[PDB]
Design a protein around this ligand. Structure first.
Ligand SMILES: CC(=O)N[C@@H]1[C@@H](O)[C@H](O)[C@@H](CO)O[C@H]1O
Length: 172
């Protein structure tokens, strides 16, 4: 069986967070996973349910850096994005605007457990300005959906949750 136990709208990163550069364009801010969201318990699963995760970014793709997409927020600011299973360290680098397999999946046994997820992003400066500061308002990022497999089914259970980037300021 499966049921939804998480939240549908999720904020990524602390509200009105401020980040400073520590070091060429596009320039990527080394924010680790400070700008993220994670929840180990989004779906409750049991009885042999097999589930993985698909992730999708809705922001426009405005470039490619080191193998993954640069998603645009404004003409001067973009994002590198990772989506995946619960632990931030297992995030899958996102490219494109299609649903992508971000967690290969697992199968619970004949007991009850949960399926979680995580998302984190890193700011990218696409074009510099005279103020050496870049701010972005709250913006929808994309979604993550559970992907049942091996015959498992979502039935009438909610499959998708969404993510919105909390407003932030980048200081250089
Ligand atoms: C309470 C708990 O730990 N659930 C982790 C869950 O968050 C994760 O999505 C899944 C697959 O790695 O394995 C579960 O054991």
């Amino acid at each position: 069986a499966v049921s939804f136990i998480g939240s549908t709208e999720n904020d990524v990163g602390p509200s009105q967070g401020s980040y400073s550069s520590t070091h060429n364009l596009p320039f990527v801010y080394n924010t680790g996973h400070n700008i993220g969201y994670q929840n180990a318990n989004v779906w409750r699963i049991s009885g042999g349910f097999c589930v993985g995760l698909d992730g999708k970014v809705d922001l426009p793709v405005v470039g490619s850096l080191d193998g993954q997409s640069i998603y645009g927020l404004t003409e001067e600011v973009g994002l590198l994005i990772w989506m995946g299973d619960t632990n931030y360290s297992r995030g899958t680098a996102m490219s494109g605007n299609s649903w992508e397999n971000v967690f290969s999946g697992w199968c619970v046994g004949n007991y009850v457990s949960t399926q979680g997820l995580s998302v984190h992003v890193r700011p990218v400066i696409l074009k510099r300005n005279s103020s050496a500061q870049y701010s972005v308002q709250k913006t929808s990022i994309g979604s993550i959906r559970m992907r049942p497999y091996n015959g498992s089914s979502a039935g009438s259970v909610q499959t998708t949750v969404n993510f919105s980037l909390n407003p932030f300021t980048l200081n250089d």
